[PDB]
UniProtKB/Swiss-Prot annotation:
Acts in the cytoplasm to initiate and regulate protein synthesis and is required in the nucleus for export of a subset of mRNAs from the nucleus to the cytoplasm which promotes processes such as RNA capping, processing and splicing. Component of the protein complex eIF4F, which is involved in the recognition of the mRNA cap, ATP-dependent unwinding of 5'-terminal secondary structure and recruitment of mRNA to the ribosome. The chain holds residues 36 to 217 of 217 of the full protein. It comes from Mus musculus (Mouse). One of its GO terms (molecular function) is eukaryotic initiation factor 4G binding. One of its GO terms (biological process) is cellular response to dexamethasone stimulus. Phosphorylation increases the ability of the protein to bind to mRNA caps and to form the eIF4F complex. Phosphorylation also enhances its mRNA transport function. GO terms for cellular component: chromatoid body; cytoplasm; cytoplasmic stress granule; cytosol; eukaryotic translation initiation factor 4F complex; glutamatergic synapse; nuclear body; nuclear speck. This is Eukaryotic translation initiation factor 4E. Changing S18A: No increase in protein levels of ODC1 or CCND1 in NIH 3T3 cells overexpressing the mutant in comparison to a 3-fold increase in cells overexpressing the wild-type. Abolishes stimulation of splice factor synthesis. Residues 2-5, 38-42, 97-104 are annotated as: EIF4EBP1/2/3 binding.
Length: 178
């Protein structure tokens, strides 16, 4: 068995407006092994098969994929917005590449600023994002942004923005662009 450098947790969010947002978050499984990642990945629905309004989140064990976690509170997210009709060709590839980024510790010296990532499957258009711990840590955020952006192979001339969770919770947006 080939250990991962971090133990990871896959969370599911159910669009169920009859329950508060927090109660719609459910833990699916945790893994700290390459084999257990693949065993999880290979036997769970693709983000694209999720119902509109549902999210899959992959966060470091002990960090709940919500703004309220101490590790997310002062954080922010690198938000990748997907075009709705590109769902089929981009969504699952981007999500997997993202999990691999997290899991593979592709952010190196800035690995500890990464909290996890969330894939929001939405009718208006999907979003994938990586949650970092301090939206004030420009270097960390920028590095994670540049590495991440390159990894997914997003058109280089298009910019992706990083929003702080604080602004996301009080919007009527970008802290950094990359
Ligand atoms: C990530 N997140 C989302 N929400 C709530 O869910 C709403 C929907 O936000 P969304 O599901 O992230 O994307 P969407 O607007 O395209 O559907 C937010 O505006 C908040 O009301 C959240 N609410 C809480 N309390 N904590 C969170 O971490 C959190």
């Amino acid at each position: 068995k080939h250990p991962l450098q971090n133990r990871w947790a896959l969370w599911f969010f159910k669009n169920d407006k009859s329950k508060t947002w927090q109660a719609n978050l459910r833990l699916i499984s945790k893994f700290d092994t390459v084999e257990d990642f693949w065993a999880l990945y290979n036997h769970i629905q693709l983000s694209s098969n999720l119902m509109p309004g549902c999210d899959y989140s992959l966060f470091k064990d002990g960090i709940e994929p919500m703004w309220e976690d101490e590790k997310n509170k002062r954080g922010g997210r690198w938000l990748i917005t997907l075009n709705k009709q590109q769902r089929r060709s981009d969504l699952d590839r981007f999500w997997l590449e993202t999990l691999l980024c997290l899991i593979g510790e592709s952010f190196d010296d800035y690995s500890d600023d990464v909290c996890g990532a969330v894939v929001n499957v939405r009718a208006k258009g999907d979003k994938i994002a990586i949650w970092t711990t301090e939206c004030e840590n420009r270097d960390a955020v920028t590095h994670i942004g540049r590495v991440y952006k390159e990894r997914l192979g997003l058109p280089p001339k298009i910019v992706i923005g990083y929003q702080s969770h604080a602004d996301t919770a009080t919007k009527s947006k970008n802290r950094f662009v990359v």
